[PDB]
């Protein structure tokens, strides 16, 4: 239940000069609804009903979650490149909580890939068929870059079906399956929509960006995640849990860890871009702080717990945290009936 | 500095051999031969192909060189997968050395790359086309999920390549880049899960180890090899990009430290390949250790290397170290030290004119 957690989280947001901005409410509404509207429509179809099979309750509330990553952590991107990024990452997610084996469906990948013939596993029907719409919004490298990490995503999944920690003494597994399963390239590369950014003016300055936004980016969800987690768990395979099986390390030394390459990637995102173009950093900073907001308002971290427990306390840092916190919600608590409607179920049926 | 660290390369280097159990083996040099030709038999029949010859853009001479370090890099480290197995992979890590003499920008060719493999449509980039075109041949050895490995790692070398046409060390200050972009070309996954091809391990029943090892190979192998090769680039003003000159780039260290880094990697790396599995299933860590001697003799025999010189200068120096890395180095000679004329023939220039 340690309490480190916040002396972390405000050095967090401190480093990485967590402030307001000018996304407001009314905007973030306008893109949410449209992010989501957009969504809904297209797993609404009886193609994408027939193949995605997941519970309608949780399609639906994953739906919900990666509406509000993407519009809260690609602040800068058009709302079009907000829909599509939320199918592509929505599709991620679904794939994240499926049990359904896939090396009978992966047999003549290659094959079939090579081909041209529409590949046997259906997620992978459905997200190689869906994928221009995302590719559409960026150069060649950029693309690439996305293409390369929902592969490893995939992946990424296969491994974590079979629920490993990896062996006493392995100390590489841990990194190796959460750079696997981070999506840590797609969302760098994503981040640079050519109608934006000029893939070759600032190839030096996104390829930089693709490879320190990739640990920070999986390294903060870590943290973040991390209340929620050793109170309700079901025997899962976290990268802290991981650092403590293949590592042989205590549940704490594997916290420190993550929390010293949390602030230290935090740290080395400014002092790298702080003085570069003023665009990247814009992108770069916004992702940031919209990604903290997200993970602070999002139910599914549960963070509104650490808040209460907290409030009519008086410290250097819950102080601080809640300072934060309460600045997330004026942004970011918005109640889904605001953007969410109709629910996907109702425009399937229809 | 402008001074090699002689003791300090021959310190670690030991180190090295002893942690991974370096020793014989029932290898014979006919054995090797045998191999060595076979595969370089294959492979030179394949790029000697009018369509390769066409496509692939490289100086006879250099595929040639390239062609022969490559074989040797398989048959020496791939000891217990099939003759053909080592054909079809020495053609495959040879169209990845390849690239590496490409300076076209990928870019123009890239354009439309998700569209046209969508579509089953011949890529626009000639290294695609072949690559793509030949891959069925390597992974037909292979179970579905060590593949997959292949195909990401193959995809993600392409970009390693493509970012290092920017010959770019990374921003002062940018820690994650060097191992990033080393990753990026290391082909850790392809090499890690090309050791058990579907006829000698079931992808299934060893499938926490295969994962184990792949995680665990890709730095051992990447970094092995960036240690044997400090010596040649250590004074090659051409190579500028490395995972060291990068480490003294982006972390802003010495030259010194950023060598002291890798060593301590390469090192713990080694130990902990042991650790894990000295007691595993006894068909893995022996496909394993003979990856990592064959890996190690291979460096130490092949000319690109150039650590001949290394032990001509200590070949008589009465210290320590000194004597154990000749010792090691005249066992990897008795098995590694090949003539080309014993198994690299006809050249693939003559078989490609006949």
């Known amino acids: 239940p340690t309490e480190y957690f916040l002396n972390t989280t405000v050095r967090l947001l401190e480093y990485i000069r967590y402030r307001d901005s000018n996304y407001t409410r009314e905007e973030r509404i306008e893109n949410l609804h449209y992010a989501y509207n957009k969504a809904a429509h297209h797993f609404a179809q009886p193609r994408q009903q027939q193949l995605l099979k997941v519970d309608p309750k949780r399609l639906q509330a994953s739906l919900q979650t990666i509406v509000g990553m993407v519009v809260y952590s690609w602040a800068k991107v058009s709302k079009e490149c907000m829909a599509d990024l939320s199918i592509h990452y929505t599709y991620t997610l679904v794939l994240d909580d499926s049990k359904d084996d896939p090396y009978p469906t992966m047999v003549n990948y290659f094959d079939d890939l090579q081909a041209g ?197 008086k410290t250097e840092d819950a102080q601080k945290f809640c300072k934060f916190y309460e600045q997330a919600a004026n942004v970011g608590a918005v109640s889904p009936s605001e953007w969410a409607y109709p629910p996907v179920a109702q425009l399937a049926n229809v």
């Open 117 to 313: 013939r529409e590949q046997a596993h259906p997620w992978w029907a459905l997200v190689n068929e869906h994928f221009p719409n995302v590719l559409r919004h960026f150069g060649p490298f950029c693309s690439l870059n996305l293409i390369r990490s929902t592969l490893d995503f995939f992946e990424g999944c296969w491994i974590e079906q079979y629920n490993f920690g990896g062996f006493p003494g392995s100390h590489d597994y841990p990194q190796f399956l959460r750079r696997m399963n981070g999506l840590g390239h797609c969302v760098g590369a994503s981040l640079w929509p050519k109608e934006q950014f000029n893939e070759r003016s600032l190839f030096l300055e996104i390829t930089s960006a693709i490879a320190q936004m990739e640990n920070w980016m999986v390294w903060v969800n870590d943290l973040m995640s991390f209340y929620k987690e050793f109170d309700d768990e079901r025997d899962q395979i976290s990268l802290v849990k991981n650092y403590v099986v293949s590592d042989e390390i205590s549940l704490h030394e594997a916290l420190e860890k993550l929390t010293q390459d949390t602030l230290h990637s935090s740290k080395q995102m400014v002092a790298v871009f702080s003085d570069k173009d003023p665009q990247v950093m814009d992108t770069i900073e916004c992702f940031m702080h919209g990604y903290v907001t997200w993970h602070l308002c999002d139910r599914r971290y549960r963070l509104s717990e650490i808040y209460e427990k907290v409030k009519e306390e």
